[PDB]
Amino acid sequence: TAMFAETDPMTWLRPTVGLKRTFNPRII
Amino acid sequence: SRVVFDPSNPTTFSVEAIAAYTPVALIRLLNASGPLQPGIADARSIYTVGAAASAARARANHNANTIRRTAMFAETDPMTWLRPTVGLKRTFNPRII
Amino acid sequence: SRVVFDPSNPTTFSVEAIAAYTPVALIRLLNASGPLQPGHRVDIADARSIYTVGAAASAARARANHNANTIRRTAMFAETDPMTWLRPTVGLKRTFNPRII
Amino acid sequence: LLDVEATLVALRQQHLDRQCYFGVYVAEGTEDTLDVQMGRFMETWADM
Amino acid sequence: PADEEAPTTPEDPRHPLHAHQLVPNSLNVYFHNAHLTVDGDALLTLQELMGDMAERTTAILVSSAPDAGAATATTRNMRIYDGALYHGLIMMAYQAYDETIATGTFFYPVPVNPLFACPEHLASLRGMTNARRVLAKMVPPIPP
Amino acid sequence: IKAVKDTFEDRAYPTIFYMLEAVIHGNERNFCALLRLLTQCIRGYWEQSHRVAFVNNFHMLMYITTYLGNGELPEVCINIYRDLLQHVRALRQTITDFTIQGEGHNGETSEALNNILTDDTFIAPILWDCDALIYRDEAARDRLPAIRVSGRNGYQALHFVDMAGHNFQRRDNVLIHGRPVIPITP
Amino acid sequence: AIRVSGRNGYQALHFVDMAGHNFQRRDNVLIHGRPVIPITPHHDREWGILSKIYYYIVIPAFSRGSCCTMGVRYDRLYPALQAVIVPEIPADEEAPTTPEDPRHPLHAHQLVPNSLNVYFHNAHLTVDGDALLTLQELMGDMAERTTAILVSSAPDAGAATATTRNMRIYDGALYHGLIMMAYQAYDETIATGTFFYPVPVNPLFACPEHLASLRGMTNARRVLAKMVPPIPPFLGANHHATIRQPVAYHVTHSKSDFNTLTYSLLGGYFKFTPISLTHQLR
Amino acid sequence: MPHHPHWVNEHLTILQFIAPSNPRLRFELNPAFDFFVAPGDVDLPGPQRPPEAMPTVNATLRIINGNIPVPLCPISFRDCRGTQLGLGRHTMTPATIKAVKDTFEDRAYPTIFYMLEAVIHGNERNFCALLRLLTQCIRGYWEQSHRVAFVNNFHMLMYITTYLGNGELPEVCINIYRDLLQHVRALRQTITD
Amino acid sequence: SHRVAFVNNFHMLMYITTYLGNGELPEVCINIYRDLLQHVRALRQTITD
């Protein structure tokens, strides 16, 4: 998803950071 | 008894069983509109103690395979009247034998 | 005897046959400290000197055994020989090798 | 320093206008929080 | 693994933290920020260090009374005040319009002594467009 | 000088390292354990950009410079640190030999009136331990301590808290001393 | 007038052992024998004179700032390193010292805390067998005593008056004094000051670091010693001689160069001697 | 000592050398002799408790004329000595400057060096072992850090120069040692002639 | 090609400096904008002073 984090409604326990696309997963 | 509505009781064993693959699905399962407040610092304290317990369990599990290093204090042997036993630190590769 | 707290008999015969670090490891593993009630007023010459000289002798014997298979060293004085009537004896170049072959 | 009392009393008698008493009053807290106290202080400074 | 090792660089499938235990979302940003060379010893030391947790941060305000013997008795008006802060850091790099830190979420302004101030860090709270902006722009309030 | 000025003005230094250093400053054993990763991280940072950094931790800088006595890093940052230390020593020597002392009524006052920074009366940017406060109180014999922390005449003194005392519902509670590895002692 | 160890004359000792230890020996110098007990001069004193001259001029000129010396308890630190670590090497086989093979002599298998072994691994640029045999040889030959030498002699009468005839110069020295220039109190692996102790031996070898490293001096004592010279009269002969203040005043206020300092010393080395005056006139 | 001596702190000389004062005159009278206060009825050696003594004046000839007052006019003396000595002399080199800076920066003196000095001061077996292990030691030291260090050990330097003479030491270190030896020899020859 | 590009856009400059900049970049080519931003800051400071 987009790298923007901003804020999340689930702040009761801990803030949620964003997700970046700077990775290339591979099985092998 | 693993109940997400009232996590006051499952604060150690549930977190220990969570490991690392549970929170990924737990975040989606708990969503945003969830009435988990009944049963604001109490939630933070529960989260911190659960994280501490999980870290302690992970450290204990990791130390089982390796050898638990002792303290860095000197005079660790009874024959200490001129100079204690001085050796290698814990920064090397942890091996048993 | 087997207790290493007060070495009085197994100081060299029980250490030459095994590794020299075994008594040190045993001492290190033996608890953390000893009681001060049985103090000694004869300084260290009672048993500590005997233990140290025995350990030194064991280390020297181990070093001699290890160096037996290798080439031993010599002195520094050279150009000395009884057959100086005709010609003197010259030295040898430093061409030592780790392996004989 | 003992001869400045007359000068101080004369200056008090003649008197001059003053401004921004709150900024140099020097006060203290009453065992409050940090973020809320800072926000209240900023609001009071802005509106006073 | 027992009696085994893996390269620090993420180029071998045998690494436990290469693709299986990396996990998405939360750990991706942390890995991108601090993808340094780590191993079992580093992980163990980090876990040991993580066992010490503080409580919060607080500020301490104290004062000292100078020698009250200059003019007479205790009629002097000379005083000296001292400041102290607990769990603080010195920052010299201020972002211009970065969105990494929101308004009053991670970093917030704190009172400082009137010896060496800066307006760049005092405006990190934002929340002002014209009125409070131009108010804070000319006069920087020093705490009493 | 211009290199470090450009590095400071770049505004690209993350605060995570500073926060970690601040957290670990209170645990000597933890710092010693983490030095193994710290050396690798600083080597990687130097390889990425040989420009020097980490100037907000004098104790950490001196510790790493004294520990790095082998020569595993180029003598650039070490050379700059040595030059700065030599300049500081020269300034201290000039200050000491440009003035004289000996006169005193009930305490040390010559250096306090000369440079001020030697005395404990001068303020500090950030306080870490209570040893500085204890030394200031001990040296403040001629000065009456007007302690007015939150209106209280005296300040609370306590040792480190355990894992069960992490409650956040407390007010006016300081955190001094600690458990790097015991009564209160400087 | 020889006054070594506060007595007249000196003796010699052979290879000592653990059956003749004497920690309170008086008037006994250690030479560890002489294979080549008769005493004969085997080495020329010119080298010693040159070494003393170098220690007296060029070394202080180079390291005038931040210079200090201190000793350690040799009699308490010598019989404490009795250890030996060596693997088994077969005939016609190599013994690599690289820290990669599992057969390393100092591998992380079973050891003790602190950092002596890691320091040895860092400074492993030498061989292990030679160090082991050197330690074994040094085990049977150690120094368990220390003393100071205070000489006193009158070369000649500088003046016809009897006041200058009864005068006698005094020089202070410390035998078996190890040279320790740098000393930092940041050793967390051992107790601070448990074995080391600072002691001035030269008026120019006084530094505030050594005085403050004792951890037994109060602030008032430190500030008092920072103003007056703390060199003992029997160890440095500061106030005993005529040049007490200027010898340090000029060396502290010069701070220009080594060449300038040496030139000033050469200029001021023209003593009040008739021969020197005649040479200067010539 | 209840009070502090007024003679050790001679920093207040720029005014006492113009205006004579009792503390600066009761001790020094002539530039050829030095007068000092008599001890407290204690001889050499004496007891720990000094009894009450009587004042006296003792004249002792100065073996070394190092008590000449410098600060009356040091600029002219420095200028004259510079213009009389520093005209066509030896100059330092960047290599030696860098070596001095590196030795100042390191300032370690470790236990290995302490043990090396201890075994060098005197031992037959240690000397005979060093005569063989010196090449390996210097090679390892150079490969760990080619920086020049531990030059003050003249005994080990002369031992190395007398034993190892087959071209094993680095050429830079050999050249540095040769030029410093030549400079010190020239200085000694000049000071003797 | 021993040449640099992307010198006619300002919106993307902030994004690349905030995201791409981590440390593992060639300092011999990313320092071109450093002088420009230093000059911009200097002129802003002189204007506001």
PDB file of N, CA and C in Angstrom, chain B residues 70 73-80 84-85, chain C residues 5 26-36:
ATOM      1  N   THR B  70      27.955 -15.338  32.484  1.00  0.00           N
ATOM      2  CA  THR B  70      27.926 -14.884  33.865  1.00  0.00           C
ATOM      3  C   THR B  70      28.186 -13.380  33.933  1.00  0.00           C
ATOM      4  N   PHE B  73      31.833  -9.152  36.871  1.00  0.00           N
ATOM      5  CA  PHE B  73      32.574  -8.834  38.082  1.00  0.00           C
ATOM      6  C   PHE B  73      33.775  -9.761  38.240  1.00  0.00           C
ATOM      7  N   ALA B  74      34.795  -9.263  38.930  1.00  0.00           N
ATOM      8  CA  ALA B  74      36.020 -10.013  39.160  1.00  0.00           C
ATOM      9  C   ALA B  74      35.864 -10.889  40.403  1.00  0.00           C
ATOM     10  N   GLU B  75      36.982 -11.441  40.875  1.00  0.00           N
ATOM     11  CA  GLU B  75      37.063 -12.326  42.043  1.00  0.00           C
ATOM     12  C   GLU B  75      35.897 -13.316  42.088  1.00  0.00           C
ATOM     13  N   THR B  76      35.809 -14.119  41.031  1.00  0.00           N
ATOM     14  CA  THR B  76      34.778 -15.142  40.909  1.00  0.00           C
ATOM     15  C   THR B  76      35.237 -16.510  41.398  1.00  0.00           C
ATOM     16  N   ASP B  77      36.442 -16.612  41.949  1.00  0.00           N
ATOM     17  CA  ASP B  77      36.981 -17.868  42.439  1.00  0.00           C
ATOM     18  C   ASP B  77      37.515 -17.687  43.852  1.00  0.00           C
ATOM     19  N   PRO B  78      37.498 -18.747  44.665  1.00  0.00           N
ATOM     20  CA  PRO B  78      37.965 -18.609  46.057  1.00  0.00           C
ATOM     21  C   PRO B  78      39.419 -18.184  46.180  1.00  0.00           C
ATOM     22  N   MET B  79      40.284 -18.598  45.252  1.00  0.00           N
ATOM     23  CA  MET B  79      41.709 -18.277  45.319  1.00  0.00           C
ATOM     24  C   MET B  79      41.933 -16.899  44.699  1.00  0.00           C
ATOM     25  N   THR B  80      41.577 -15.867  45.463  1.00  0.00           N
ATOM     26  CA  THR B  80      41.702 -14.474  45.032  1.00  0.00           C
ATOM     27  C   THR B  80      42.358 -13.681  46.158  1.00  0.00           C
ATOM     28  N   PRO B  84      42.619 -11.614  40.349  1.00  0.00           N
ATOM     29  CA  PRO B  84      41.542 -12.544  40.000  1.00  0.00           C
ATOM     30  C   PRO B  84      41.791 -13.178  38.634  1.00  0.00           C
ATOM     31  N   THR B  85      40.820 -13.974  38.195  1.00  0.00           N
ATOM     32  CA  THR B  85      40.887 -14.642  36.901  1.00  0.00           C
ATOM     33  C   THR B  85      40.323 -13.713  35.833  1.00  0.00           C
TER      34      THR B  85
ATOM     35  N   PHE C   5      41.537 -27.741  46.749  1.00  0.00           N
ATOM     36  CA  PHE C   5      41.531 -26.590  47.648  1.00  0.00           C
ATOM     37  C   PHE C   5      42.849 -26.472  48.404  1.00  0.00           C
ATOM     38  N   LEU C  26      38.631 -26.233  37.029  1.00  0.00           N
ATOM     39  CA  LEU C  26      37.990 -26.768  38.226  1.00  0.00           C
ATOM     40  C   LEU C  26      37.921 -25.721  39.331  1.00  0.00           C
ATOM     41  N   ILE C  27      39.000 -24.957  39.517  1.00  0.00           N
ATOM     42  CA  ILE C  27      39.006 -23.902  40.527  1.00  0.00           C
ATOM     43  C   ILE C  27      37.972 -22.835  40.189  1.00  0.00           C
ATOM     44  N   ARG C  28      37.898 -22.442  38.915  1.00  0.00           N
ATOM     45  CA  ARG C  28      36.924 -21.435  38.505  1.00  0.00           C
ATOM     46  C   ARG C  28      35.496 -21.924  38.717  1.00  0.00           C
ATOM     47  N   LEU C  29      35.227 -23.191  38.396  1.00  0.00           N
ATOM     48  CA  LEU C  29      33.889 -23.743  38.555  1.00  0.00           C
ATOM     49  C   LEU C  29      33.537 -24.033  40.009  1.00  0.00           C
ATOM     50  N   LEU C  30      34.530 -24.161  40.884  1.00  0.00           N
ATOM     51  CA  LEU C  30      34.285 -24.452  42.295  1.00  0.00           C
ATOM     52  C   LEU C  30      33.712 -23.211  42.968  1.00  0.00           C
ATOM     53  N   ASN C  31      32.388 -23.207  43.162  1.00  0.00           N
ATOM     54  CA  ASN C  31      31.625 -22.133  43.798  1.00  0.00           C
ATOM     55  C   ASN C  31      32.088 -20.745  43.365  1.00  0.00           C
ATOM     56  N   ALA C  32      32.087 -19.797  44.290  1.00  0.00           N
ATOM     57  CA  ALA C  32      32.510 -18.430  44.003  1.00  0.00           C
ATOM     58  C   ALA C  32      33.575 -17.923  44.963  1.00  0.00           C
ATOM     59  N   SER C  33      33.508 -18.303  46.237  1.00  0.00           N
ATOM     60  CA  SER C  33      34.482 -17.857  47.221  1.00  0.00           C
ATOM     61  C   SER C  33      34.561 -18.880  48.343  1.00  0.00           C
ATOM     62  N   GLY C  34      35.671 -18.838  49.075  1.00  0.00           N
ATOM     63  CA  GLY C  34      35.889 -19.738  50.181  1.00  0.00           C
ATOM     64  C   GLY C  34      35.825 -19.030  51.519  1.00  0.00           C
ATOM     65  N   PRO C  35      35.481 -19.770  52.572  1.00  0.00           N
ATOM     66  CA  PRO C  35      35.412 -19.164  53.905  1.00  0.00           C
ATOM     67  C   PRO C  35      36.780 -18.705  54.386  1.00  0.00           C
ATOM     68  N   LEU C  36      36.775 -17.623  55.160  1.00  0.00           N
ATOM     69  CA  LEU C  36      37.994 -17.056  55.719  1.00  0.00           C
ATOM     70  C   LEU C  36      38.295 -17.560  57.123  1.00  0.00           C
TER      71      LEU C  36
END
